[PDB]
């Protein structure tokens, strides 16, 4: 691999039933955003993880990561980009974390 670090934490949230004005957020998305929100936590561990691919600690994060994936897939977009994009994003995100974890365990590399 060659480097890997990027993001953009900037997403509003104000769900309510107030006619007129900007529309509410999509549930199909929030569903993912809800999971992702957690992922971030599993990520912080990775970025600050240490061990191997065998170590239990890793198994915890490893499983935890996937746990979210399934939750990301469990989401049925049916045919909504706003959702799909989020899904493919959330999934792609966690994935990157997994690919990083295994690496973090096999030894970090940044500096």
**CATH number of the domain that residue 81 is part of:** 1.20.58.120
* Domain that includes residue 39, residue range: 1-111
Residue 96, SS3 per DSSP: helix
Measure CA 97 to chain center: 8
Q: Which residue has the tokens 């990561």?
A: 65
Tell me how the structure was determined: NMR
For CA atoms 33, 92, 28, 72, give the dihedral sign: negative
Q: Do 96 and 4 form a contact (C-beta atoms < 8 A)?
A: yes
Helix, strand, coil percentages, rounded to 5, for the chain: 60, 0, 40
Q: How many domains does the chain have?
A: 1
Q: Which residue has the tokens 């935890």?
A: 64
How many whole angstroms separate alpha carbon 43 and alpha carbon 7?
A: 12
Nearest Cα neighbor of 4 from 104, 90, 91 is: 104
Q: Do 55 and 105 form a contact (C-beta atoms < 8 A)?
A: yes
Nearest Cα neighbor of 43 from 12, 64, 71 is: 64
């Amino acid at each position: 691999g060659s480097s890997g670090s990027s993001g953009a934490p900037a997403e509003p949230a104000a769900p309510k039933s107030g006619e007129a004005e900007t529309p509410p957020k999509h549930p199909g998305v929030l569903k993912v955003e809800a999971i992702l929100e957690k992922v971030q936590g599993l990520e912080q561990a990775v970025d600050s993880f240490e061990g191997k691919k065998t170590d239990k600690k890793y198994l915890m994060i490893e499983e935890y990561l996937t746990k979210e994936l399934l939750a990301l897939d469990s989401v049925d977009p049916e045919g909504r980009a706003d959702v799909r994009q989020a899904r493919r994003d959330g999934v792609r995100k966690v994935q990157t974390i997994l690919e990083k974890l295994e690496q973090k365990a096999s030894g970090p590399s940044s500096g």
